[PDB]
Design an enzyme around this catalytic site. Structure first.
Site, PDB file in Angstrom:
ATOM      1  N   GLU D 116       0.850  -1.179   0.000  1.00  0.00           N
ATOM      2  CA  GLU D 116       0.000   0.000   0.000  1.00  0.00           C
ATOM      3  C   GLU D 116       0.894   1.239   0.000  1.00  0.00           C
ATOM      4  O   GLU D 116       0.670   2.175   0.765  1.00  0.00           O
ATOM      5  CB  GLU D 116      -0.900  -0.061   1.236  1.00  0.00           C
ATOM      6  CG  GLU D 116      -2.115   0.863   1.188  1.00  0.00           C
ATOM      7  CD  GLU D 116      -2.893   0.940   2.495  1.00  0.00           C
ATOM      8  OE1 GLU D 116      -2.490   0.282   3.479  1.00  0.00           O
ATOM      9  OE2 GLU D 116      -3.910   1.666   2.533  1.00  0.00           O
ATOM     10  N   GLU D 125       5.980   7.851  -3.374  1.00  0.00           N
ATOM     11  CA  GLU D 125       6.407   7.300  -2.096  1.00  0.00           C
ATOM     12  C   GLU D 125       7.489   6.236  -2.296  1.00  0.00           C
ATOM     13  O   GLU D 125       7.813   5.507  -1.362  1.00  0.00           O
ATOM     14  CB  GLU D 125       5.218   6.702  -1.345  1.00  0.00           C
ATOM     15  CG  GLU D 125       4.136   7.723  -1.007  1.00  0.00           C
ATOM     16  CD  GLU D 125       3.059   7.202  -0.072  1.00  0.00           C
ATOM     17  OE1 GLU D 125       3.091   5.998   0.266  1.00  0.00           O
ATOM     18  OE2 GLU D 125       2.190   8.007   0.324  1.00  0.00           O
TER      19      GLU D 125
HETATM   20  O1  LIG Z   1      -4.318  12.722  -0.022  1.00  0.00           O
HETATM   21  C1  LIG Z   1      -4.387  12.349   1.145  1.00  0.00           C
HETATM   22  N1  LIG Z   1      -5.539  12.269   1.815  1.00  0.00           N
HETATM   23  C2  LIG Z   1      -6.718  13.024   1.420  1.00  0.00           C
HETATM   24  C3  LIG Z   1      -7.546  13.504   2.586  1.00  0.00           C
HETATM   25  C4  LIG Z   1      -8.879  13.136   2.709  1.00  0.00           C
HETATM   26  C5  LIG Z   1      -9.646  13.573   3.775  1.00  0.00           C
HETATM   27  C6  LIG Z   1      -9.057  14.383   4.707  1.00  0.00           C
HETATM   28  F1  LIG Z   1      -9.805  14.816   5.758  1.00  0.00           F
HETATM   29  C7  LIG Z   1      -7.748  14.775   4.630  1.00  0.00           C
HETATM   30  C8  LIG Z   1      -6.994  14.328   3.558  1.00  0.00           C
HETATM   31  C9  LIG Z   1      -3.116  11.947   1.914  1.00  0.00           C
HETATM   32  C10 LIG Z   1      -2.628  13.134   2.713  1.00  0.00           C
HETATM   33  C11 LIG Z   1      -3.235  13.846   3.741  1.00  0.00           C
HETATM   34  C12 LIG Z   1      -2.572  14.919   4.318  1.00  0.00           C
HETATM   35  C13 LIG Z   1      -1.309  15.281   3.873  1.00  0.00           C
HETATM   36  C14 LIG Z   1      -0.698  14.577   2.844  1.00  0.00           C
HETATM   37  C15 LIG Z   1      -1.370  13.498   2.269  1.00  0.00           C
HETATM   38  C16 LIG Z   1      -0.960  12.586   1.177  1.00  0.00           C
HETATM   39  O2  LIG Z   1       0.077  12.583   0.540  1.00  0.00           O
HETATM   40  N2  LIG Z   1      -1.981  11.706   1.012  1.00  0.00           N
HETATM   41  C17 LIG Z   1      -1.976  10.647   0.016  1.00  0.00           C
HETATM   42  C18 LIG Z   1      -1.958   9.287   0.623  1.00  0.00           C
HETATM   43  C19 LIG Z   1      -2.945   8.584   1.334  1.00  0.00           C
HETATM   44  C20 LIG Z   1      -2.376   7.312   1.654  1.00  0.00           C
HETATM   45  N3  LIG Z   1      -2.886   6.254   2.329  1.00  0.00           N
HETATM   46  C21 LIG Z   1      -2.108   5.167   2.480  1.00  0.00           C
HETATM   47  C22 LIG Z   1      -0.819   5.061   1.988  1.00  0.00           C
HETATM   48  C23 LIG Z   1      -0.275   6.129   1.294  1.00  0.00           C
HETATM   49  C24 LIG Z   1      -1.079   7.252   1.138  1.00  0.00           C
HETATM   50  N4  LIG Z   1      -0.862   8.469   0.512  1.00  0.00           N
HETATM   51  C1  MTA Z   2       0.167   2.296   4.846  1.00  0.00           C
HETATM   52  S1  MTA Z   2       1.281   3.626   4.406  1.00  0.00           S
HETATM   53  C2  MTA Z   2       2.762   2.691   3.942  1.00  0.00           C
HETATM   54  C3  MTA Z   2       3.338   1.861   5.065  1.00  0.00           C
HETATM   55  O1  MTA Z   2       4.484   1.128   4.572  1.00  0.00           O
HETATM   56  C4  MTA Z   2       5.564   1.297   5.457  1.00  0.00           C
HETATM   57  N1  MTA Z   2       6.801   1.172   4.696  1.00  0.00           N
HETATM   58  C5  MTA Z   2       7.253   2.023   3.719  1.00  0.00           C
HETATM   59  N2  MTA Z   2       8.398   1.658   3.200  1.00  0.00           N
HETATM   60  C6  MTA Z   2       8.722   0.489   3.874  1.00  0.00           C
HETATM   61  C7  MTA Z   2       9.824  -0.382   3.778  1.00  0.00           C
HETATM   62  N3  MTA Z   2      10.835  -0.202   2.932  1.00  0.00           N
HETATM   63  N4  MTA Z   2       9.841  -1.461   4.597  1.00  0.00           N
HETATM   64  C8  MTA Z   2       8.819  -1.635   5.446  1.00  0.00           C
HETATM   65  N5  MTA Z   2       7.735  -0.881   5.624  1.00  0.00           N
HETATM   66  C9  MTA Z   2       7.743   0.178   4.799  1.00  0.00           C
HETATM   67  C10 MTA Z   2       5.352   2.665   6.093  1.00  0.00           C
HETATM   68  O2  MTA Z   2       6.046   2.783   7.315  1.00  0.00           O
HETATM   69  C11 MTA Z   2       3.831   2.662   6.272  1.00  0.00           C
HETATM   70  O3  MTA Z   2       3.443   2.021   7.481  1.00  0.00           O
END
Ligand code: A1H76
Ligand code: MTA
Ligand code: A1H76
Ligand code: MTA
Lengths: 307, 303, 318, 318
Positions: D116, D125
């Site tokens: 994820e 990411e």
């Molecule tokens: O886009 C975003 N969320 C939208 C949102 C919706 C409702 C609300 F009240 C506030 C924010 C997040 C986010 C929030 C704040 C600041 C930055 C971010 C950001 O890079 N996001 C993307 C994102 C969600 C996510 N889940 C799991 C793993 C990786 C992830 N990457």
């Molecule tokens: C659910 S958001 C992504 C999740 O993956 C974890 N994660 C990201 N990169 C790595 C990695 N290289 N090894 C293990 N966990 C990771 C982050 O700490 C977060 O909990």
């Protein structure tokens, strides 16, 4: 009187080559850092693991010689804006390698070509190099007055040369430069090496380059006419251009083989010297102002300040 | 053996003549000195050992391309901008310089001898193509038709006035010096190598930078195949009546193809760039390749 | 750059010491009866343009012992010099390796590893980290040259140097970043307030489990004058082999050597010191997976701020 | 933080899609006759507080197939949650691993890896780098969920958003750094000048030799109005398994899902665009051993400066 260099794309012995160039009156030498034909692989085996030294040793010259007398050249095979992804990636790695070796040697300048419209990835790699480490090395963009496609001979049966007056199209090489330096965000390290052709373009195409950072003017041996004595000279059109360029105080580079075989190679340079001496001498203004060219100063405020 | 003490690493060309003596060109593209050399091997298997050579000579600059001028003569494409001509002596032990004319303003990258044998055509990085007379030792014509470095030029086997050329401007020009406008452009990826068909005057093949080998008829519709993964350096047909096409590349492989460009042979013998191929005139199934790895490999082609 | 290596090579005292260190180690490792049976595997880790390789050759010749050289170097521009030299002069006895020593998979373990990874504050070029990562391809009884190095600190008073650092303020960064980073400087107009004391020490090969290169050192400097502390001069000593050493510590300075200049750790604010008072400084060596840096603070006679927390102003790249 | 994971978990549409993707993959990999012979080895790479683990359990139960779970997570604060859950609820079926997936030495190869690690611009990411380094402990016939993801770009005109970015100027950094970094933003007061086009694509497992995650993409956007380009909206799509997808691209947006907001790549200077003209943008994905970043430039109808050269203004930490 005039600062001149020699462009070569063939140097079999770096020490011997310089001596010959220096004996002919040249101040510096534009030459490769890697062999122009020495194409290198960086991804695919087995050619990426090619053994042996990649180029000449830095020890073959003194530090001072590298610093003052040598201008680097990008290898001709390096094409960062190629359509083929492999050639792009390879040329990227190669360009960085060559530029890095230029910095290592402490070269004062390094030539890169602008010989097509799209030089975006070229710009992206150069900009990355400029913002890596520290160096005062200049980058001279080799850009022609007239694009190669526009000064080719009309000898292709099913592809005639454009006999139409295209005002914007004849200024295309300036747009190549303009886009490149805009991408690079007007780096003070990036300047123009303006390549003069056999047929000069219209006047507007030349006026285009007014106010541009021209550091060099490349003169091919091919553009030289021959007088009654049998020695190289230039046309009245080219003469006026050189006279204009001498005001900008650019450095004239001679490129190409000796078409005037019966004479020495110093003759070309002697002609530029001849032109240099034969110009309207500086008046009271230009004599005194000499030194303050494009030097920014704060407007005096005799009321607020005591002079 | 009345020759240089050591030849250069990067082998650029290899050609067989009538009897079966292997001609070698080589350049130093690395180290202190960037020069070239020419070598002869009456024993092909002895290559590339310098202690067992018929002839050998050191040239001023690197050797970009060469080809046989019949039996005695060797024409060179130099980095200096000169097109050099060397001639074997009557004993065929020395190699004396016949002529060396600095006319190109940049590296001479490709050269080819026309049908007559008294004429040749050269292509250079100065975007020029020049027609030579080997007798009078002068340039007959000079042509700036392309808009970028000329990569390959190939004379028509049986027509003196006709030759091909290809350049980085993505043009394949078919020439004929009898016409006022001699060049004629044949209709994606840049062409890197050319080869006329030996038995058909109107047919030729071209290799590109992307590794594709193409089959072109002059009149017309083309056929092609993805033979190599990298740029095609050269294409050489076999001396057979029904010829086999040997293809070399920068992917460090050799492939022998049939008439329909189907793969017959494969060789990953070289470790560096494969620069040339030459079929043995004695044994038509033998093919000699040279590369920058300093190997001179002899391949048994299943025919 | 080329001309950076050039000036290093222009110090004959340093390499004569390296030559003598290797000469002695070869005699100790190989007896007279095993002169021509035993070929010692030497590995120059960070060969540059090859001053050590040459010294290693000279050392083996004056000792009259057989050696097999590797010349590991990550800088590809320097590797060009090495390979040209190797083809022309050295030959197959020297195997030029173009790699990071921490990455390189060695095809053979070394009897000696030789390195020149020391700066003005010894470990300021991350010599510990590099030699730790090259440790695996050392024989269990193998030697490292240098085998040890120590950094020294001394409090200084220089209103000139303080004013010089001040002037290194740049646009687009912390207004006081210039005070939170060391400088290489030939100290001239200054006053050394107390005698240098050892700060950080490193031994190679390192045999302490969980090899931790992080450090924390408290130094107390007795001051016998009134003055204004403006920073801390840094020096270093290194043990190449046994009694063969190099040093830029003023009192044990190697005579003639001019490769390393002193280092200077400034402080944001000058500190008054009365006669009889002790200057107490604290030095940390810190690291993560990407960077190494120093932090420092004065605790007596008054407290300063901790300088360079989290390497915000200055890091050394791994 | 805890409350960052909390809000991710509050998106049931996303995890139901993950549940369905795994459910389908289990049925494809295990036939009916091998229901209770074959136990599939699942590995959640980046488990967080364990929403996927739960979904993996639900998926196996609705499929009626046996699974063995690993829960790899580098964040040690999240690992506290996992282990408390694991002790109380899951049991020995789930093996909580507290490690980086690029480092972890697996005691068993996986049939499925679930992740994820996707942001608003898919690969922002460093999902490519992480899954590349976890690739070795996937079975030769193993599956990755997600198996593919693509990023999309679209030119926008927003004098509001331009003016918002402008205001992110901070002390002690480049005056125009704020324009050379992306932002997550719910785009409201804006005008999408052209339809989104695919920028960068990644496939897992990656089977191309010399797995290079660097990229360079040229996009030409036909504009049919006069306007002022202020930046580029970024979206993404991902293929979890087969027909099970997630998307924030407006035209294929997953209904109900509110986990990912759009991303915005600004430009320093606004660019005039006439009706009929094409906006041409260039996007690079760049990297070294320490960082990954984007660079971008407009080339038509006029040139912009290259934004974020060498990741000077914005990097993504490896
Ligand atoms: O886009 C975003 N969320 C939208 C949102 C919706 C409702 C609300 F009240 C506030 C924010 C997040 C986010 C929030 C704040 C600041 C930055 C971010 C950001 O890079 N996001 C993307 C994102 C969600 C996510 N889940 C799991 C793993 C990786 C992830 N990457
Ligand atoms: C659910 S958001 C992504 C999740 O993956 C974890 N994660 C990201 N990169 C790595 C990695 N290289 N090894 C293990 N966990 C990771 C982050 O700490 C977060 O909990
Ligand atoms: O202290 C220094 N040299 C002193 C000096 C002497 C004379 C002169 F004309 C100029 C400078 C160099 C140095 C120079 C310039 C800028 C920084 C430094 C620096 O960190 N040095 C220490 C140093 C030398 C060295 N050699 C090998 C390996 C690692 C090394 N680390
Ligand atoms: C003589 S100055 C130190 C030399 O060691 C080299 N060096 C530093 N660290 C390493 C490393 N990890 N691997 C290889 N060479 C290194 C540097 O590039 C330089 O040439």
């Amino acid at each position: 009187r005039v600062s001149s260099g020699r462009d070569l794309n063939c140097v079999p012995e770096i020490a011997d080559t310089l001596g010959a160039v220096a004996k002919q009156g040249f101040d510096f030498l534009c030459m490769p850092v890697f062999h122009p034909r020495f194409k290198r692989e960086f991804i695919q085996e087995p050619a990426k693991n090619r053994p042996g030294p990649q180029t000449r040793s830095d020890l073959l010259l003194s530090g001072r010689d590298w610093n003052t007398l040598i201008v680097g050249k990008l290898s001709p095979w390096i094409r960062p804006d190629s359509k083929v992804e492999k050639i792009r990636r390879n040329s990227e790695a190669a360009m960085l390698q060559e530029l890095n070796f230029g910095a290592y040697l402490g070269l004062p300048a390094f030539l890169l070509p602008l010989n097509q419209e799209d030089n975006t990835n070229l710009a992206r790699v150069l900009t990355n190099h400029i913002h890596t480490g520290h160096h005062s090395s200049m980058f001279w963009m080799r850009v022609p007055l007239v694009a190669p496609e526009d000064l080719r001979d009309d000898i292709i049966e099913n592809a005639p040369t454009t006999h139409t007056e295209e005002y914007s199209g004849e200024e295309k090489t300036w747009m190549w430069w303009h886009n490149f330096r805009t991408l690079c965000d007007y780096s003070k390290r990036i300047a123009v090496a303006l390549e003069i052709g056999a047929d000069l373009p219209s006047n507007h195409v030349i006026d285009r380059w007014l106010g541009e950072p021209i550091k060099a003017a490349i003169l091919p041996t091919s553009i030289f006419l021959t007088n009654k004595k049998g020695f190289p000279v230039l046309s009245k059109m080219h003469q006026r251009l050189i006279f204009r360029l001498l005001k900008l105080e650019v450095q004239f580079i001679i490129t190409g083989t000796n078409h005037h075989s019966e004479k020495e190679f110093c003759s070309y340079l002697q002609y530029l010297e001849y032109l240099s001496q034969n110009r309207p001498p500086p008046n009271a203004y230009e004599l005194f102002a000499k030194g303050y060219e494009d030097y920014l100063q704060s407007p005096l405020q005799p009321l607020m300040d005591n002079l | 053996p009345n020759a240089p003490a050591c030849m250069e690493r990067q082998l650029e060309a290899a050609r067989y003549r009538s009897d079966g003596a292997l001609l070698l060109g080589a350049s130093s593209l690395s180290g202190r000195c960037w020069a070239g050399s020419l070598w002869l091997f009456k024993d092909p298997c002895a290559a590339p050992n310098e202690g067992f050579c018929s002839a050998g000579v050191q040239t001023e600059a690197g050797v970009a391309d060469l080809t046989w001028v019949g039996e005695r003569g060797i024409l060179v494409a130099s980095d200096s901008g000169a097109v050099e001509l060397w001639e074997l002596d009557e004993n065929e032990t020395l190699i004396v310089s016949k002529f060396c004319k600095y006319e190109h303003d940049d590296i001479v990258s490709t050269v080819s001898v026309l049908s007559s044998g008294t004429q040749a055509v050269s292509g250079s990085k100065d975007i020029c193509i020049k027609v030579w007379d080997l007798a009078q030792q002068v340039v007959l014509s000079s042509y700036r038709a392309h808009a970028a470095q000329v990569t390959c030029v190939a004379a028509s086997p049986h027509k003196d006035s006709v030759f091909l050329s290809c350049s980085e401007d993505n043009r394949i020009l078919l020439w004929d010096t009898r016409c006022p406008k001699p060049a004629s452009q044949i209709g994606g990826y840049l062409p890197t190598s050319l080869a006329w068909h030996p038995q058909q005057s109107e047919v030729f093949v071209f290799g590109d930078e992307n590794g594709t080998v193409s089959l072109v008829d002059t009149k017309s519709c083309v056929l092609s195949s993805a033979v190599h993964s990298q740029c095609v350096t050269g294409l050489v047909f076999s001396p057979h009546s029904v010829p086999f096409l040997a293809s070399l590349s920068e992917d460090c492989s050799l492939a022998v193809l049939d008439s329909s460009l189907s793969e017959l042979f494969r060789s990953q013998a070289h470790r560096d760039f494969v620069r040339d191929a030459t079929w043995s005139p004695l044994n038509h199934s033998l093919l000699t390749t040279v590369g920058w790895d300093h190997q001179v490999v002899h391949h048994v082609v299943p025919t | 750059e080329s001309q950076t290596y050039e000036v290093f090579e222009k110090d004959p005292i340093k390499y004569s010491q390296y030559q003598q260190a290797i000469y002695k180690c070869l005699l100790d490792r190989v007896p007279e009866e095993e002169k021509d049976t035993n070929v010692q595997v030497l590995m120059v880790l960070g060969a540059g343009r090859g001053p050590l390789v040459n010294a290693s050759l000279r050392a083996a010749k004056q000792a009259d012992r057989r050696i097999k050289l590797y010349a590991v170097e990550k800088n590809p521009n320097a590797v060009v010099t090495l390979e040209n030299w190797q083809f022309e002069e050295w030959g197959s006895q020297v195997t030029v390796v173009s790699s990071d020593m921490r990455e390189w998979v060695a095809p053979e373990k070394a009897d000696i590893i030789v390195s020149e990874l020391l700066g003005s504050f010894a470990d300021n070029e991350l010599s510990p980290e590099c030699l730790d990562g090259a440790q695996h391809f050392l024989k269990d009884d193998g030697v490292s040259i240098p085998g040890e190095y120590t950094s020294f600190l001394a409090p200084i008073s220089s209103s000139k140097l303080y004013n010089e650092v001040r002037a290194c303020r740049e646009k687009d960064r912390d207004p006081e970043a210039q005070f939170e980073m060391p400088y290489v400087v030939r100290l001239h107009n200054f006053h050394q307030l107390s005698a240098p004391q050892p700060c950080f020490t490193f031994s190679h090969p390192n045999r302490d489990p969980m090899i931790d290169n992080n450090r924390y050192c408290t130094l107390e400097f007795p001051v016998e004058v009134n003055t204004v502390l403006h920073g801390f001069a840094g020096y270093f000593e290194t043990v190449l082999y046994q009694d063969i050493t190099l040093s830029i510590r003023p009192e044990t300075h190697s005579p003639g050597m001019f490769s390393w200049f002193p280092i200077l750790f400034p402080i944001k604010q000058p500190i008054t010191v009365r006669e009889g008072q002790t200057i107490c400084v604290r030095f940390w060596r810190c690291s993560n997976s990407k960077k190494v840096w120093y932090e420092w603070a004065v605790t007596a006679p008054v407290c300063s701020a901790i300088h360079n927390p989290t390497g915000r102003s200055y890091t050394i790249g791994l």
